[PDB]
């Protein structure tokens, strides 16, 4: 099985969160239990509920009660989570996950595959794409054997942001740091890569910044300065 998760990462308070998990490699209506689990920032795993593949029966965490609907779309080999009347308590990373039905070898009751996780933020603030700035290597370090160069991804909302280098062809020496949250409620993050200084005269370094909530893809070329 592959579990492919999708859905918006910004939900206005009291409105409805909606996530979908597209399944490949197994027919949803043939068996297994298809479930949702969330993890609020810095906290543990929280059970939401599941739907049985064979029966269509649903089971929910009683603390989520009247707000949860889980359903399946056999036409699309997908299942969904709708969580209504959201508040700050619903801000979390949400995962879909599968386990086998009661009656199989109980090893298979362990959650065997997981969606990649969707970061969901409940807020009445509107999305804001980042300003992306190149971080030129210091000229002093370019006169030495290695140099650090980076990109500043400033003042975005909400999380997450993805950064790659040279369309994914540059990976070694890449360090993308977790974001800071400013007093303004916007996030900023930086990615840095260390390269042979020799390479600055023959390679081009571009950071590929992706902020899906605002539909912002930005490629910023890092230029080399001598002062």
């Amino acid at each position: 099985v592959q579990l492919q998760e999708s859905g918006p990462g910004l939900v206005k308070p009291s409105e409805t969160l909606s996530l979908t998990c597209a399944v490949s490699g197994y027919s949803i209506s043939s068996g297994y239990y298809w479930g949702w689990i969330r993890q609020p920032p810095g906290k543990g795993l929280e059970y939401i509920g599941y739907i049985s593949g064979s029966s269509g029966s649903t089971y929910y965490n009683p603390s989520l009660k009247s707000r949860v609907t889980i359903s399946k779309d056999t036409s699309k080999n997908q299942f969904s989570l709708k969580l209504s009347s959201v508040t700050a308590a619903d801000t979390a990373v949400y995962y879909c996950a599968r386990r086998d039905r009661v009656g199989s070898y109980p090893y298979y009751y362990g959650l065997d595959s997981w969606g990649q996780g969707v970061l969901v933020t409940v807020s009445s603030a509107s999305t804001k794409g980042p300003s992306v700035f190149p971080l030129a290597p210091s000229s002093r370090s370019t006169s030495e054997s290695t140099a650090a160069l980076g990109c500043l991804v400033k003042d975005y909302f909400p999380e997450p942001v993805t950064v790659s280098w040279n369309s994914g062809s540059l990976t070694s020496g890449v360090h993308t740091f977790p974001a800071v949250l400013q007093s303004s409620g916007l996030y900023s993050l930086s990615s840095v890569v260390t390269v042979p200084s020799s390479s600055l005269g023959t390679q081009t370094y571009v950071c590929n910044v992706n902020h899906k909530p605002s539909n912002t893809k930005v490629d910023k070329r890092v230029e080399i300065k001598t002062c």
């Binding site: 543990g44 795993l45 996950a97 969606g115 190149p134 800071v180």
Partner: protein, 219 residues
């Protein structure tokens, strides 16, 4: 129904970590299927151990043979046992059972520390404001700090040798893949504030040793 895990646990390399998962008294650990998940920063949990008894148990996919389980009926507690401890064992471990309708029940997780990791001074990179950002009359200094251990760090900014208190936001340290820690600090300024000083400094103190990087608006 409730599973109780200690928030944190430390253990020595080579020895064994015994992570407990205490079941509320309405359950009998003797007859419960236990599941343990390992979770590292940035990834979903992964099934680590299924444990019913020494007779009926399975390691999760890709889990080494030095992992085992147990149950103490007297304390109604299940245990995850990790022998021959290595740094890559450092992670969050969640225990889990299911109720009569196959509803998940999770413990809150134990963060496992493997002792004896060698001290590591931070590597520090300070970037000045870019010319693009200065055009927008803003200036952000970026102080990036990585590869330090333990994961406690103190950051101080100086302007012309004087402490800078305003405009500073520093992240909590976060565990990197190699089990060292990363953090970053941002000094947010106006273009005119940035021009009014001959240098700015990011000072990173780690277990009594200070690493310092400096940046000058002269450029």
């Amino acid at each position: 129904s409730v599973l109780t895990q200690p928030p944190s646990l430390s253990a020595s390399p080579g020895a064994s970590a015994r992570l407990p998962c205490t079941l509320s008294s309405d359950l009998s650990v003797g007859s419960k299927n236990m599941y343990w998940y390992q979770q590292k920063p940035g990834s979903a949990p992964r099934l680590f151990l299924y444990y019913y008894s020494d007779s009926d148990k399975q390691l999760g996919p890709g889990v080494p043979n030095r992992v085992s389980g147990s149950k103490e009926t007297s304390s109604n507690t299940a245990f995850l046992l990790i022998s021959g401890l290595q740094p890559e064992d450092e992670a969050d471990y969640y225990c889990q059972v299911y109720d009569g309708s196959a509803n998940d029940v999770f413990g809150s997780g134990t963060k496992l520390t493997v002792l004896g990791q060698p001290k590591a001074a931070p590597s520090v990179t300070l970037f000045p404001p870019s010319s693009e950002e200065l055009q927008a009359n803003k200036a952000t200094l970026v102080c990036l700090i990585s590869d330090f251990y333990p994961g406690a760090v103190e950051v101080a900014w100086k302007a012309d040798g004087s402490a800078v208190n305003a405009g500073v936001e520093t992240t909590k340290p976060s565990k990197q893949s190699n089990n060292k820690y990363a953090a970053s600090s941002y000094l947010s300024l106006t273009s005119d504030q940035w021009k009014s000083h001959k240098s700015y400094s990011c000072q990173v103190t780690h277990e009594g040793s200070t690493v310092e990087k400096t940046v000058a608006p002269a450029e």
